[PDB]
Amino acid sequence: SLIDPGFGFYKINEFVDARDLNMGAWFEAQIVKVTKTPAEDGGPEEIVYHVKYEDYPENGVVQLRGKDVRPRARTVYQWRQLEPGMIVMVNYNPDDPKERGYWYDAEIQRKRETRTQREVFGKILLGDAGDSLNDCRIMFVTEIYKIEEP
Amino acid sequence: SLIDPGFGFYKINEFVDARDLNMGAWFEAQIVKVTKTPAGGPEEIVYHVKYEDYPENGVVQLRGKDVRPRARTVYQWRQLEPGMIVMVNYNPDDPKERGYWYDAEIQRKRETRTQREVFGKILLGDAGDSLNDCRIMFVTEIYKIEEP
């Protein structure tokens, strides 16, 4: 099923999460090809992951560096596991903050329990050129994922 | 996924190249909406696009001439010949430096003291007049123009 090209962290046909550089949001993707490119500083060869997005074939094949690819998110935190300072993957909608949106990394800043509900607030990390959003109320506190590493 | 508006060349969410009306060069874009506008005769299609890397410019209305399938194929040197209309990287303000992607009519090519050189007429569409006898500095990155 999975084919090891012999380098890089992901197999051909492996299902992964891929980050869109403009948005900062993570999307379900699949490795289609893995290539190498010279480092700029004479260091180790840099790995390029060629991915396709599972629900967005219109995007074609996109070439990404390691920072923008990781194993597919699969584990959700229990409430007691959430603590300020953790970097976690959350759902958030920057345009309509009360609604479902995209999947972003966030630094948890604060959690509390009110008389009505459990609340989590976090610093949302956006795109490479995009600033962070502070004190974002994460509306889906039972859908906060652990970020996987290779 | 793509969505068919029922007319025109491009689907909703389709990724394309689209001209900057405020510059004349071509930019990665995506179809947002497709509509028709009254002409007096045949209704004309309006493609509403957003530019991938310029969200701040929002959605812009373009006619078909200012939208085309995204560039994907580079020419080999041996393929370049005077008269061809191709897409090149050029900077009108600092002509030796990288700029943006303009259509160009190839006028001359030659090898000078081992350096491949290409000269051509830079086209701006209707964003401005053409720029004649421009040296194209990036001769290994000259692209085929796609059609619908």
Partner: peptide, 17 residues
């Protein structure tokens, strides 16, 4: 499968970029 809203990623492949 994650529940999502909104559209897809903003960038598509572009060989020149």
């Amino acid at each position: 499968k994650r529940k999502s809203a909104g559209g897809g990623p903003s960038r598509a492949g572009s060989p020149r970029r």
